[PDB]
C-alpha cells in the first residue's frame, strides 16, 4: 500500500 | 494527547462541518486532504512528494478542529492517497516530537 | 529531546558510521534513503505516496543511529528527495507525536 506521506510545498 | 508511532497516528477532524480521519503528517509542510467540496475562492497549485508533483486546489484561512484542537489555515485538496495533516496545522495545535 | 515543528524536522543520523541529514516523517511507515551505494543483500521494492511511486533497494537489519539513539531494521534506498525516517525507526528511538 501507498505509505510514504513525504508532502513538499513547491 | 502523547501518540506513539507502532500504528499511523490517524485522528479524527471536522472541516466544512464534515467529519474525516486524517494522519499527523511532520513529513508533510502542508495539510492536504482528498477530493471535497469546501466553500470560498480557491487557487490552483502544485506540490510534490515521493512519486512525484499533483495539483490541488488551494483554499486559505479554513477552520479545521483536529483531535478536539481548533486550527484555522490553509487547507490543499487533491489527488493525496490519505487525508495529511501537515506542519502548517500541526504548529497551530502545539504539536511537536519527542524522544 | 523535543523538535518542534515550524521547519522540517531533519535531524543528523550515522549509517555506516558516515552522518547524514533526515528528516523525521510520522508520515513514512518506512525509512528510505538517498541513493548510496550500500553493502549487502537487498530486494526490489515499490513505495508510493503524493505523485505515485518508486522503485526502491530493501536492505535489512542495517544499524542507524538518529540524533544519538541506536536503531537497526529495514531501510530503503532509492531516488527519494530527502533521506526518511519513518515509523519503523522513530518507534525503536521511543518518538512519540505531542499535543
Given amino acids: ?10 | 494527547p502523547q501518540i506513539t508511532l507502532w500504528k499511523r497516528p490517524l485522528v479524527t477532524i471536522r472541516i466544512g462541518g464534515q467529519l474525516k480521519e486524517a494522519l499527523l503528517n511532520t513529513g508533510a509542510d502542508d495539510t492536504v486532504l482528498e477530493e471535497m467540496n469546501l466553500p470560498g475562492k480557491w487557487k490552483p497549485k502544485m506540490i510534490g512528494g515521493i512519486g512525484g508533483f499533483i495539483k490541488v486546489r488551494q483554499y486559505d484561512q479554513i477552520p479545521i478542529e483536529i483531535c478536539g484542537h481548533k486550527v484555522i489555515g490553509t487547507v490543499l485538496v487533491g489527488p493525496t492517497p490519505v487525508n495529511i495533516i501537515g506542519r502548517n496545522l500541526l504548529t497551530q495545535i502545539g504539536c511537536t516530537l519527542n524522544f
Fill in chain 1, 1 to 10: 500500500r501507498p505509505g510514504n506521506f513525504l508532502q513538499s510545498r513547491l
